[PDB]
Amino acid sequence: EQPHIGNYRLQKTIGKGNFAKVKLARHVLTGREVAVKIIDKTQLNPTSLQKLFREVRIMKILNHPNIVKLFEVIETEKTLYLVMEYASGGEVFDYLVAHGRMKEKEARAKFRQIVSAVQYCHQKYIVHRDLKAENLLLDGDMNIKIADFGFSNEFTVGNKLDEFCGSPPYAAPELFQGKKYDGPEVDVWSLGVILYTLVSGSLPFDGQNLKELRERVLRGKYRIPFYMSTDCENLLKKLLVLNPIKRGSLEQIMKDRWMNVGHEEEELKPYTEPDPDFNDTKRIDIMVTMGFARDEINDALINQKYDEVMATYILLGRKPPEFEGKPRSLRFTWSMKTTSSMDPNDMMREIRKVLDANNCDYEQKERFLLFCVHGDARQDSLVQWEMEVCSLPSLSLNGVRFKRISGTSIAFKNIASKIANELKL
């Protein structure tokens, strides 16, 4: 029986991977929603267990509105639990699944938040090294929420790193060569791969094998589409520079023309951390009435070890759940390809038939939600995802929400697109 861990009631899985799985949960004392990353302690070798100490250490010190925040760390002998901020809006590549290549003015809104977060990290001498699409999540307001610092580490001027941990398509060419790197320049490369992909719909480098992907990456030439602005193409000449010394630093990037069109007054400036507010008396007096002793509270916030007591206090300064006095009414990136007037239960009968024809297996979980799976794990093509029928802000219109649980974004986009093209609603 595992419905609970610590003070949390665990819910569905919202993320899965080779060595970690994430579940949505509700804190039982304060009602807030969280994501719980479940790391199995028995399958770690010397290197992965040094990454996990680096991961919890680094998340303890980042405090930025577009970086997933840590709430509590709970340990057992064989399992480690990181309780963190739940990003309920999906991932930034959902725009490309739903709508294809993004408009530069919309890509700029997210890329300003991504660069703000990533440069805030580089200002605290932290490099992410896994800035790939799967790690750019969105909250309920579609704000960027950068996640999974598992491959992350600190850097110091004068010292160099040698690990290669991130995804090959987003990896700077120094990594492909086994070359000792300085750090923050491999994220600046990797952000150029992200921006090229959001405004063009596909990755800048790709081959049908790693040797071809490596060769294309090292030559550093990508396709300039007809619809791409000079401004955007001049910025990628600052991100995708083959020589790491010649690549801009994100401080310069912030002052690039393309990142500030539409923002002439408010230019993108380095984010300055707020001041630590570990003495909010309203939240302390709420905790004492929930059964915590004032001294235990004060000590826990001075010791800063992300235990039960510190977790309740952080969670209290998050928006409470709304007071309580059939498809869901949700705000998601709907598309006219999947919007319809048809009765939702016949919408699911249609969704289930199309899944069968493209050899997708699924399991019904709620009245309007399926968990779907397609591909073969040998071909790096296995992908799992949710499909839910949700209402839109009108009278009888409903859509189909796709959310990836597992698998590559590339493979998710292929299978989700093909289902959406063939839904007849």
Side-chain angles (χ1 to χ4, degrees), residues 115 235 238-239 248-256 259:
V115 159
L235 168 61
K238 317 195 191 186
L239 302 177
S249 73
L250 297 198
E251 180 133 43
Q252 296 123 64
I253 297 301
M254 296 203 174
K255 303 195 290 164
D256 168 72
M259 319 269 312

Side-chain angles (χ1 to χ4, degrees), residues 357-364 366 368-373:
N358 310 258
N359 249 344
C360 292
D361 317 292
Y362 48 93
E363 195 185 40
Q364 197 123 4
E366 316 172 27
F368 305 111
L369 191 176
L370 316 165
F371 184 91
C372 315
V373 50

Side-chain angles (χ1 to χ4, degrees), residues 64 66 111-121 254 268 270-271:
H64 183 296
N66 318 105
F111 206 65
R112 276 171 73 93
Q113 296 178 327
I114 300 168
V115 159
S116 173
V118 175
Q119 175 284 326
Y120 161 81
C121 293
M254 296 203 174
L268 197 64
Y271 176 86

Side-chain angles (χ1 to χ4, degrees), residues 32 280 283 312-318 320:
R32 282 58 177 177
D280 173 327
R283 270 187 286 171
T312 297
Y313 162 94
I314 287 160
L315 285 176
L316 276 174
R318 317 276 298 176

Side-chain angles (χ1 to χ4, degrees), residues 173-179 181-189:
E174 39 270 50
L175 303 178
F176 279 100
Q177 293 172 283
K179 293 163 64 123
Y181 53 106
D182 214 313
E185 62 289 336
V186 309
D187 297 328
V188 180
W189 177 278

Side-chain angles (χ1 to χ4, degrees), residues 397-421:
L397 286 199
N398 284 38
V400 177
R401 194 193 78 222
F402 292 77
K403 184 186 148 63
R404 182 192 65 93
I405 298 292
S406 194
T408 303
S409 87
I410 296 103
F412 173 58
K413 168 185 190 184
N414 283 358
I415 191 52
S417 286
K418 166 162 271 291
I419 274 68
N421 282 330

